[PDB]
Design a binder for this molecule. Structure first.
Ligand SMILES: CCCCCCCC/C=C\CCCCCCCC(=O)O[C@H](COC(=O)CCCCCCCCCCCCCCC)COP(=O)(O)OCCN
Ligand SMILES: CCCCCCCC/C=C\CCCCCCCC(=O)O[C@H](COC(=O)CCCCCCCCCCCCCCC)COP(=O)(O)OCCN
Ligand SMILES: CC(=O)[C@H]1CC[C@H]2[C@@H]3CC=C4C[C@@H](OS(=O)(=O)O)CC[C@]4(C)[C@H]3CC[C@]12C
Ligand SMILES: CC(=O)[C@H]1CC[C@H]2[C@@H]3CC=C4C[C@@H](OS(=O)(=O)O)CC[C@]4(C)[C@H]3CC[C@]12C
Ligand SMILES: Cc1cc(NC(=O)[C@H](c2ccccc2)N2CCCc3ccccc32)no1
Lengths: 562, 275
């Protein structure tokens, strides 16, 4: 009995043993040669590898305190599989996964662990195979469960796991970035149901949401079927998304009207509205960070800072506040400070790109731009190397008598078309500049055509995958907007006030269903493999050889009998 | 044509007849042309205002030839590609605006520090001139910042142009991969459309309507037998082809070998006992 066999001392000895086929180095980095490894350190390194905002049942201070002070793991298979994947023992991990509770959750964790170990660190080989194999197994298990029962598969996809720090399968898949799992039909159906919220409407959803936002009192009553109806309509994430979009458009229009016209000693009403917008957004950001409690206050910001867009937003807010402060510093400083928050507008116009990835037909363009930014960066070096040489040569040939005056960069970088063409059309002094002009003119068009071809190839390569990639971001967007309150950014100031004012048989059935699903998967795999033509041909050949040999031997007996 | 579209009675005949978009557009164009003609004969003040309407109306008639240019083998792919790329251009417009308008507004705000709205800023922001911006490219910071803005705008313009080129190339390739197959379908519609129509041209069918008003089982059994024979032959051929498949034959041979080997092994014991 593994349950009876399992014990703290035995597991510690197993972990600390070196009699077998990167655990030591990784533990040392996370944490002393031949140091006695305990469950606490193993859990700590596990949490390190999983990522931020994660937890492990064994990897906790209370568990460490208990260990320091039955002693049987209720689910030994989980720890055994975690160890097996930790020490890079694949067949044993497969066997353990063959018999275990909540196999899908463990499989996704293994895929996450394999990828994380590969990135931290044969390393390439295991990354390509081990992590991919675990992900494929999870996908196959999901597919079988959906075939057996759609409702039960949907229920299994989302439910709190006490063992794994209460993280659903979807969250683990997203953390592992396994696009295949999310792309499955059941996952997309669940995401669409979540996005539509309580309302079941599925035809002309955008127009219906726009009408509901425009005409609450009349639209909401009818839209509820497709009081409490208005409240549940508001709480849906889609209407929140449209509300935020409209508020952002209004903010953009006010910002355009403010900076573009005039300035006075005291700001106008529109500038006050914009300042209120930014103040409320800052309050919302601070609240969101505050609710990001896991890891305590000190270790909450570190995880929250992973996203780049959030950091850019903070930087933009700081620059806007600095510009506003400088504005109210008399005319000499007002004129100097206006430009800063005039330039600040650029960030807000570009922030819509991160929101333009939601649409099916719009995200490919953003992905292509992101891909081609680096290509343009590299192309710039070649462009400079080619053009600057000829420009410098042409400039040197002309203006034989000259003084630096820090004014040659403009002359070399001018690169005019009409002027060069005219310059194209004693004798040698005229011939050489013509040759230089012709070479520059040819090089310009050569580079232009090269850039065109580069962009075409990059766009084709991006488009070959953008459709598959698009589906992943939907879960992030939906889980992001769903958590956010219902009021727009300028009106959530009251929302915070309301927030402050406010302050087992099914499990057994699911376990049985999972066991049945895995048994059926193994049976189907074995039957399909045994029914393969290649295997059957081999079996027939071996049987024929033995049958022929027996017949030949029997022939001698028949002759002797006669 | 609507009158002869009798099925569904008078009330339910228009509903079906209205499915085609081109017919509705034709009706709209006819109504606008008639309105413009009526306005034309309303003295000079209304004649000058009504002429423009039926001047603009010409655009529809020039574009109606596209629905007739799909017949040709080599001409329909272009129309299909245009129809496909219309939506792509619609989506591209949003990105173009989002990118360009920000820089344009920033540049406009940096310049003209003292200004009044006068409902005349859209032209300034949307001007987007090439030569003027290039000249503007080439105390110190006030000169540096506009140069940076101009350079960014100049780079963005060509980036967007190349992006549009790539998008159009990809869309054209995808359309051309299927246009040849698609073209054949429209021929039946065109043929059954023109066949029903009378012989005179549109301006002369006025007499055609006058002429119209003036005017006002063994084979079945053989066909049934042929169909029955065809379906029987199809089933027979399907069964024969499936049974002749290598995969099926290998399985059959393997099963027979196993049974034959088992019988031989059992017979061996009988032979030994007999001896
Ligand atoms: C057309 C005229 C001017 C526009 C072209 C811009 C200059 C590019 C040509 C120079 C060049 O890179 O060719 C190089 C030779 O340059 C010249 O001889 C000139 C290639 O050098 P390689 O050793 O023969 O082979 C290495 C392969 N990369
Ligand atoms: C070259 C200069 C200007 C022409 C380019 C026009 C601006 C496009 C670049 C801005 C941009 O979209 O990059 C975005 C970053 O923008 C900047 O930092 C600048 C990408 O944001 P991300 O979060 O790092 O990744 C999301 C992937 N889409
Ligand atoms: C590729 C080029 O052609 C560039 C690259 C480096 C540039 C140089 C940088 C340093 C200075 C010092 C300055 O003296 S000063 O009194 O005006 O400050 C005069 C201008 C001068 C000589 C630049 C001339 C142009 C460059 C050679
Ligand atoms: C992105 C932009 O820059 C555009 C978008 C919305 C436009 C504004 C719409 C409303 C009006 C009212 C008008 O007052 S009036 O007496 O002339 O009628 C002056 C012009 C003004 C301020 C426009 C300025 C330009 C915009 C800010
Ligand atoms: C389109 C579109 C824009 C957008 N902008 C926001 O939603 C919101 C915001 C509000 C006012 C000004 C600037 C941005 N902002 C950015 C992204 C999501 C988010 C999350 C928490 C707190 C703020 C915030 N949403 O759709």
């Amino acid at each position: 009995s593994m349950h009876r066999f399992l014990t703290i001392s035995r597991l510690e000895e197993l972990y600390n043993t070196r009699h077998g086929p990167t655990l030591y180095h990784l533990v040392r980095d996370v944490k002393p040669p031949d140091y006695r490894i305990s469950l606490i350190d193993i859990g700590l390194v596990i949490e390190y590898l999983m990522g931020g905002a994660y937890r492990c049942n064994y990897t906790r201070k209370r568990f460490r305190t208990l260990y320091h002070n039955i002693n049987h793991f209720p689910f030994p298979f989980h720890e055994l599989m975690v160890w097996a994947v930790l020490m890079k023992r694949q067949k044993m991990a497969l066997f353990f996964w063959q018999h275990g509770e909540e196999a899908m959750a463990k499989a996704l964790v293994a895929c996450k662990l394999c990828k994380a170990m590969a990135h931290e660190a044969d390393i390439s080989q295991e990354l390509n195979h081990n992590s991919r194999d675990f992900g494929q197994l999870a996908v196959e298990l999901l597919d079988q469960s959906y075939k057996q029962d759609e409702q039960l598969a949907m229920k299994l996809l989302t439910y709190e796991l006490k063992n794994w720090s209460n993280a659903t399968c979807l969250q683990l898949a997203v953390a592992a970035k396994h696009r295949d799992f999310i792309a499955h039909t059941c996952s997309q159906m669940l995401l669409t149901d979540m996005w539509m919220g309580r309302l079941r409407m599925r035809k002309n959803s955008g127009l219906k949401v726009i009408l509901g936002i425009l005409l609450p009192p009349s639209i909401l009553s009818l839209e509820f079927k497709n009081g409490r109806k208005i409240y549940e309509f508001y709480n849906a994430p889609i209407v929140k998304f449209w509300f935020y979009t409209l508020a952002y458009i209004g903010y953009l229009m006010l910002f355009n009207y403010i900076v573009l016209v005039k300035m006075e000693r005291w700001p106008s009403t529109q500038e006050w509205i914009v300042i209120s917008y930014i103040f409320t957004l800052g309050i919302e950001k601070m609240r969101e960070i505050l609710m990001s409690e896991p890891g305590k206050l000190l270790q909450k910001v570190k995880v929250w800072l992973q996203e780049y867009w959030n950091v850019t937003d903070l930087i933009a807010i700081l620059l806007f506040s600095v510009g506003m402060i400088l504005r109210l510093q008399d005319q000499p400083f007002r004129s100097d400070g206006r430009v800063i928050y005039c330039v600040n507008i650029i960030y807000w116009y570009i922030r819509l790109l991160d929101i333009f990835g939601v649409n099916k037909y719009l995200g490919p363009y953003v992905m292509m731009i992101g891909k081609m930014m680096i290509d343009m960066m590299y192309f710039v070096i070649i462009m400079l190397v080619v053009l600057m040489s000829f420009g410098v040569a042409r400039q040197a040939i002309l203006f034989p008598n000259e003084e630096p005056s820090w004014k040659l960069a403009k002359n070399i970088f001018y690169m005019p078309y009409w002027m060069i063409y005219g310059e194209v059309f004693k004798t040698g002094a005229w011939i050489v500049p013509a040759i230089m002009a012709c070479y520059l003119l040819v090089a310009n068009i050569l580079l232009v055509n090269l850039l065109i071809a580069v962009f075409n190839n990059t766009f084709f390569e991006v488009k070959s995958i953008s459709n598959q990639v698009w589906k992943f971001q939907r879960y992030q967007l939906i889980m992001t907007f769903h958590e956010r309150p219902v009021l727009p950014p300028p009106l959530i100031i009251f929302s915070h006030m309301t927030m402050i004012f406010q302050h087992d048989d099914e499990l057994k059935k699911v376990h049985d269903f999972e066991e049945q699903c895995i048994e059926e998967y193994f049976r189907e795999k074995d039957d399909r493999f045994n029914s393969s033509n290649d295997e059957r041909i081999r079996v027939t050949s071996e049987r024929v050889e033995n049958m022929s040999m027996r017949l030949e031997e029997v022939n001698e007996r028949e002759h002797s009998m006669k």
